[PDB]
Amino acid sequence: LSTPLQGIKVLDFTGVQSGPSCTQMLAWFGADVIKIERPGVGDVTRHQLRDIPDIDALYFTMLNSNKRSIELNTKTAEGKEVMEKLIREADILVENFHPFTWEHIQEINPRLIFGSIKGFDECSPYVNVKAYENVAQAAGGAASTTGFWDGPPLVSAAALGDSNTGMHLLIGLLAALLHREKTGRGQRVTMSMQDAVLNLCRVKLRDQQRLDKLGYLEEYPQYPNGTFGDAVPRGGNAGGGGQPGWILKCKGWETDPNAYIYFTIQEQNWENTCKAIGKPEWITDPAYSTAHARQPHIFDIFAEIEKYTVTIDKHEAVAYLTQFDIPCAPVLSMKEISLDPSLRQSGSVVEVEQPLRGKYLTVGCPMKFSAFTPDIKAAPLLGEHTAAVLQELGYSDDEIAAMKQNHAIE
């Protein structure tokens, strides 16, 4: 009967993934999101990585559910007029362009919130450098600290520079809406891809300061028989926090790249872990009884657990080990996730009917609310809503026809 963003109007210039992920969520929260697209071309994701000739790619449909699409040429007298009318009516304008002024917009509409995503902050030496996903992962600390100590920096499959940056801009936009309830004014909100990556790497900045102070990191694989340099090193599949763990092979790993589990050695669970793996002697042995004592031979311990896990299927391994309250889970493949019934039931993976394509899967709205449920719908066809939007703005049918004709002739 009501949604959080009921009545909110968004002008959405975003493309690719960072900005569209943000505005897709705005739409799912009830906002009217109008994608303003280049006539005859549209968002680049419509044409990238297509699996079916001549129809919008999955890259597009999974990021643009529930949006409206207009085609608009701002470089004409009528396009500029349409743009001004849209700005007067809008609550939020969002853009994520590579490197109508804000001053003018404020004068047109002092209630408007302007959201902008860039690769880097305004004062960065890299302010004018184009960033894609992995460029941000490199600049933000993640590639440096992900991977193995004897291998290269490694990018993460997770969209640390793209969807993550979108989620951070979304936080800012919702805060700005809340602030507007108090001030009656909009404002500018900016978010950089580098900063989004850094925020998720906060704990690696913790580790850099520990390393600066002490010269070693007790819980890292390099302690005590390896070497530390001046910067936090890659730790392979180490825990990353106060509880050690590792990725362990399960039955079938020679041919199945996802036949593995993650296993945590939780400090407060040590006795239960010992019972699980048939090592009751390790409950009181001073070399094993505390985390500090375990650390210098922690890989011998993981090797002992792996002697068991390699003999059974990962799902069996987790079923057995969790009886002992061990934090662990299988490494789920994208195929397993795409078919998991619980993720359908939770609305985490959602089937959507798309015009011209038929069914596709998307990731749904991740957080759950007791007072409303988003209804996830198809993505817009290019320019599907141009006429409807112009009508809502007060243009007559003859005026709309004239605009379309002028465009066709130009």
Assigned token pair, 168 = 């951070």
Q: What does the alpha-carbon distance between residue 64 and residue 46 come to, in Å, rounded to a whole number?
A: 10
Judged by CB under 6 A, the chain residues 125 through 154 that form the site for ligand MET are 130-131
Contact 135, 118 (CB under 8 A): no
**160 alpha carbon, distance to own chain's centre:** 6
Q: Does 77 bind a second copy (CB under 8 A)?
A: no
Judged by CB under 8 A, the chain residues 315 through 354 that form the site for a second copy are 318, 322, 325-338, 342-343, 345-346, 348-349
Among all chains, which residue has been given the structure tokens 């819980």? 219
Q: Does 73 bind a second copy (CB under 8 A)?
A: no
Q: What does the alpha-carbon distance between residue 351 and residue 354 come to, in Å, rounded to a whole number?
A: 10
Q: Does 204 bind a second copy (CB under 8 A)?
A: yes
Among 100, 149, 299, 369, binds ligand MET (CB under 6 A): 299
Half-sphere exposure of 398 toward its Cβ, with a 13 Å CA cutoff? 0
- Which residue, 132 or 270, has its beta carbon nearer to ligand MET? 132
Judged by CB under 6 A, the chain residues 174 through 233 that form the site for ligand MET are none
18 annotated among ligand-binding-site residues: yes
Q: What does the alpha-carbon distance between residue 74 and residue 243 come to, in Å, rounded to a whole number?
A: 55
**Strand order from edge to edge, sheet including 260-264:** 245-249, 260-264, 328-330
Pairing of strands 260-264, 245-249: antiparallel
131 annotated among ligand-binding-site residues: yes
Task: Assess whether 162 carries a catalytic annotation.
Answer: yes
- Catalytic residue among 56, 162, 195, 207, which? 162
Backbone angles phi, psi at 180, to 5 degrees: -65, -30
Choices 47-55, 91-99, 196-204, 278-286 (CB under 6 A): range interacting with ligand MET: 91-99
Among all chains, which residue has been given the structure tokens 């296993």? 263
Among 32, 56, 219, 306, binds a second copy (CB under 8 A): 219
73 annotated among ligand-binding-site residues: yes
Among 129, 277, 312, 393, binds a second copy (CB under 8 A): 129
Judged by CB under 8 A, the chain residues 145 through 174 that form the site for a second copy are 145-149, 151-160, 162-164, 167-172, 174
Question: What residues contact residue 278 under an 8 Å CB cut-off, 6+ apart?
Answer: none
Judged by CB under 6 A, the chain residues 328 through 387 that form the site for ligand MET are none
Among all chains, which residue has been given the structure tokens 């079923």? 319
Question: What residues contact residue 105 under an 8 Å CB cut-off, 6+ apart?
Answer: 87, 93, 112, 114
- Which residue, 221 or 380, has its beta carbon nearer to ligand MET? 221
**Of these partners, a second copy, ligand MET, none, which one is at the site of residue 303 (CB under 5 to 8 Å by kind)?**
ligand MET
Q: Does 260 bind ligand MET (CB under 6 A)?
A: no
Q: What does the alpha-carbon distance between residue 234 and residue 141 come to, in Å, rounded to a whole number?
A: 11
- Which residue, 222 or 386, has its beta carbon nearer to a second copy? 222
Q: What does the alpha-carbon distance between residue 256 and residue 241 come to, in Å, rounded to a whole number?
A: 29
Q: Does 164 bind ligand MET (CB under 6 A)?
A: no
Backbone angles phi, psi at 146, to 5 degrees: -110, 135
**Of these partners, a second copy, ligand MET, none, which one is at the site of residue 202 (CB under 5 to 8 Å by kind)?**
a second copy
| Residues of this chain that bind ligand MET (CB under 6 A) | 18, 96, 98-99, 117-119, 130-131, 246, 248, 299, 302-303, 306
Residues acting as catalytic residues: 162
Which positions make up the binding site?
Answer: 17-18, 38, 72-75, 96-98, 130-133, 241-243, 266-268
